[PDB]
Symmetry: D5
Subunit: 172 residues, 10 copies
């Protein structure tokens, strides 16, 4: 049962970072906020636009001490090819955020974003606080994408509370 | 565990406060319209009214978009009413243009997955539901932290665009903006 | 089914409003004392305040008898305080001399068996608890009909009588009257 | 066991006027019933309660209420207790029915049964004309009930049933109820 | 408990009995060293039951000299038993009984000896002869309308004491003192 | 196993007048039935009882009762015993049916079956014409029963059946009940 | 359902009639000796005695062979005695030179699987048990058809051969051969 | 397994006079059956029985009895064994059916199968013309059977069948028998 | 998964000659089917097997056999891999259908699914015109298969289906 | 369902015929060596002996490669022996240079999942087991169609190349060829 006040599910797996394979886990990221967002498939249409947007804006999350990780049920071998593929040919260009592979479906299932019809995940966005605890849960229907600006907004409010202890109003 | 989009949204029937009166509303009354259903933990709290006041003041932007906004909580109807009739300067809601849905039995909060056993009251979810009663968007916050009337409006525009034009909405998608075909 | 006396009363812990402030109270904080715990369905209702007020005005009679009176409802602490802050002229609680216990998790109402699945509201029960936490009297009234402060005190007197004198109290027993010796 | 629920059914041999007659809860439809329990025949607090209720019977007869006393003793023990005069420690002669539960079925259904004992805790259940439970009182054995509070509770439920109104704290006959 | 069987330890009973107009708590281990004739009756203030109890009480010294305690049991409370005893026989009472009246109000005892009736709430008429070591010997169950035989109860008791002492066995229709069959 | 309930059914092979016949409880409907068990054929206390009833048959006959003796022995062990002379240690020849239950079904149905040895305890059961049990009597093996008490109880049950009255303690014939 | 003969034989313990008095015996008593344990349906029947009489007439042939023949049935020890003490003229056993084992509790016949649930009796079994308690031969016949002392002798001869000489025995193998 | 009963059904591939045929217990209805099991093909003691039963087959055929040998070996093992001459350790050419049970069902059904070495003990089961179990013989493996005893047992079961009487101990053919 | 029984059914998206097509085992009745699995797209040993079966495709077509390659990759990944030039490590444009299992249920039915990684072991299943299984090959991942042995095997089963005669050890074309 | 590779192969222990005498063999005995364990339905069959004879005629190709070939069927040991003894003109096995493993109990065929409940016989499996007892290959043929010694050798070569050189063999790979990193 996925709720904001509880420890986030541990994810572990193989990711593509700077054109190489590295093995990452949620516990590595302690001390930082983590934005973990799922997309349905590699070589899709709406999906690359999101990953590219977050990558181009990665420094916004870096300055905010947040690590953005993009997970999908494709293999690391697709993640790599898709990264090696230039944006004109339909590829990802080269990405500044890790692309995490769930070939086991374990990660998409643990976060409850897994779709039994497709075999691939919905689009979740989960903001995990530095202590490994879930904060925000966003799940979008596949046709409709997310907002880098709203993720930045939320990220800023949660940080505002962990520091000030005042609680954040609407439209913040 | 957590709700999924592209699946029929959980049914809610409840007693609600509309224009200072009690009405019994359900989900199927709003068929033909989108429904933004958003939860808050408690009446006579602080972060809570600021969101409802905002959704209420902006309600015409949802109305023009063929959407109903319904706030729900685990408080009774007489709390919803008392809070409503109280002026905002007294920390009340002022008089409210959006229905306040009382879930006393915890049924609706537990159905949408936003109920937590620690408080006895709801996390703030925001769910967007299509005219056929199908779930589209899911948002849940840790409640120091509130939601955005502009992002709800945005998402609203996006799903309406998809259903209308059969195209899909990219990242950061806006109004009068291009989608992608199939 | 429902409770039986001469058995330890169900425990409770929760957020209560006392003198316009929040405080955590539990059944065990009241040990060495009798406890009258009574339930009402909702805040900002009609029959509910009349009872709360009544028990509050008469508090001293419960205090001199070594009893703590505690009102409980499935509303919250925040709903409770807003009610207690209001003027009675405005339909409020005035200001309350007894703790208002928030049942919000619903688990106090269920423990005492007074919980109504239809409205998600508590019925009106009243429970007399001895200084060791034993259950003595049980009353549950249907919602539209309210309770009696003087009958509660009458029963409270009776149980203290049999406690002190080890006697038994006959029907319609009145304060100071002495009962039957089971000697 | 809550109010605004159908009251449990009871059926059994009762002592009425000094004869045995089988009674059931449905017989009393249209009438209010006060069903009250006592632990034992030939004891101390028990007769005083029955006697008081019997002396006051007409006060209930004016409310369209039937009072019934139940316990886990036999009909044969009930009868001999009635035949015994009060000066002898008996019931005198009763204007009220004594319902016997030898099977413990009835005590257990109303949840007043004590398994350390074999006999009932003293409960009082006011049941409305349609067989729907209204009030529930259960006293620990050493402490008996009040005839006068039972009349008070009774007056209130009838006042709600009539005016549709609701009865506040300490409500007695000839007082204003709060409008719905 | 389809049926009890002889040559097995008798079911234990501990209860509250009326002995000489007073309440005593007695158990089966208390009478260890002695035989026990334990017999059940359905109800106090009835027809056949007193005639049975009065008859065992009038003949009680025949059992005392045979080193056997007689106990009557029923599902009535100790308070019924005491009122039935204290009542004179003219009124339908018990006179005053020289045997203990055992109250089993929990039905445990009558259920344990198998004589309890579900359609009733009171016991059938059992008669169980129990040897000094707690072993069951004879089992008699009569339908309620028909009563028992104090003289036949005495005959069997005599028989088991003969068997016990002389290591012989008692034939059909065996009368007290007669030689039985060796080995 | 209680007096107010219908009795267990038994169907078995019995020895009636030196021959084998299959009998069952429903045959005896309309008549009273005294069914009693003995542990073993060819023992000391068992025949005394069987003979006692077999000599007394006309008291049961005139009372509309049939007396049947059951045991875990075979019908063949029964018949041999019944061929034997009492002088020889046998049964002589019996006026009452000897019911063989070799399957233990009957003894177990009536709850008198001992698992320590394969022999039944000696019980005695009185069944009214309608198949309803009345008396249960079970004795430890070394101690045998009384024809006179069985006869006494017979009169008692028939009395209450007939006159509607209940029989007091120590009741005998020529006495009025309650 | 059946027990198989590479395996330790089921234990039996009961009351036996030996020499005319009751003795309690078991299967571990006869360790060091071979055992032939055979079952018959009932005492005081026609076909049963002929088998026991025969084997008991053959005793020294089983004795010289270090084997103990044992009869068993579901009858009581008291039926065994009466039958043994009976003359052969009345259908009795005469006085037997082999033990008569009683199974009252039926557990021996059930352990060896010869027990018939239809009648209370057992079929005719024959089980040859080696000195260490292991089962070797299993013979079971329907009631109407009896056994052979010669064949039991042959198998015994063969089973004793195969252990001693370590050679396997062919079909129709006789008192010594090869 | 007890012989008042219906015998367990067997159906399998048998080798009969050089051919593979499917046979079942129901086929031999109307006839007696001697069904005996042996542990292995190309063993020692087994041939001796199979051959002696084969050479003596006319005594069974005149008695209206079919002799069937069953093993857990394949039909292919059987045929080759039956092709092998006796001097060479084979079955010669034998006149009796060899029933092959590969899946162990049959041997398990008659209870002569042991999971130890995975091949059958030697049972011999006599089955009346209606398919009813009559005699059960089970030999430990080292020790073989008797054709002459099986012939005796068979003569007795038929005698009982025809004349309604029984067979005493050591009954021979044309002996008296005991009337019931 | 024994040879003599009807094969597990598959249904799903495939990339056939640049298009997405829904295929299932029953579509191929009247034809033999070689359904072979590989762990992942954009791997190393995997493309060599597909390209070889694709290059030899006419050998199977004249033998009345359909070759389908299944992976646990998406149809979208299959598409790009086949849009990828061989020199660049892709499939060129390959002449056999690429069957997509996202739900893993095809690889689970045929038994070749690995829990260790989300990828299939390389199985090769030969299925007859009536949908009955014929032969099972399962290779450990690091070692690939042979197009000539599949061709040999396929030839043999067609020989028994035709002549009723049995193919012995090392049987090659038209022996008997 | 099915045996998977890169997993420890099921243990087998039985009575086998080697050289014409019985011997007790087991999988663990062969540790340190590669094992090809292959199944056939029956003794005294037609397709079956051809395969057995072929592996026993080719036995040196396997010994050179450090592999023991083992033939298992559901027949007993005495059937294996009589078959091995029978001359090939009578349908016999000639005499075998490879162990004939008897599964009377069916445990082995059931462990390797090649057991056919229909005939009680076994299918034709061929399993390549590595020196550490791990299963690198599963080959199961429908009965009417027999296996290939050369493909078995090819596969054997391949799993040895990958273990030695840590590379991965492509399609159609034979001895002397290169591989991929």
């Amino acid at each position: 049962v996925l709720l904001p006040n509880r420890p986030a599910p541990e994810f572990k797996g193989q990711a593509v970072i700077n054109g190489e394979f590295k093995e990452i886990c949620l516990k590595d990221y302690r001390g930082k906020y983590v934005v973990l967002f799922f997309y349905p498939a590699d070589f899709t249409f709406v999906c690359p636009t999101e990953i590219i947007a977050f990558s181009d804006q990665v420094e916004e999350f870096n300055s905010r001490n947040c690590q953005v990780i993009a997970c999908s049920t494709d293999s690391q071998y697709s993640h790599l090819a898709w990264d090696n593929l230039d944006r004109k040919s339909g590829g990802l260009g080269h990405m500044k955020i890790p692309l995490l592979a769930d070939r086991k479906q374990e990660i998409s299932k643990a976060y409850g974003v897994f779709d039994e019809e497709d075999g691939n995940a919905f689009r979740g966005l989960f903001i995990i606080d530095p202590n490994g605890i879930l904060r925000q849960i966003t799940i979008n229907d596949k046709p409709v994408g997310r907002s880098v600006d709203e993720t930045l907004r939320l990220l800023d409010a949660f940080q505002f509370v962990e520091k000030h202890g005042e609680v954040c109003p609407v439209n913040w």
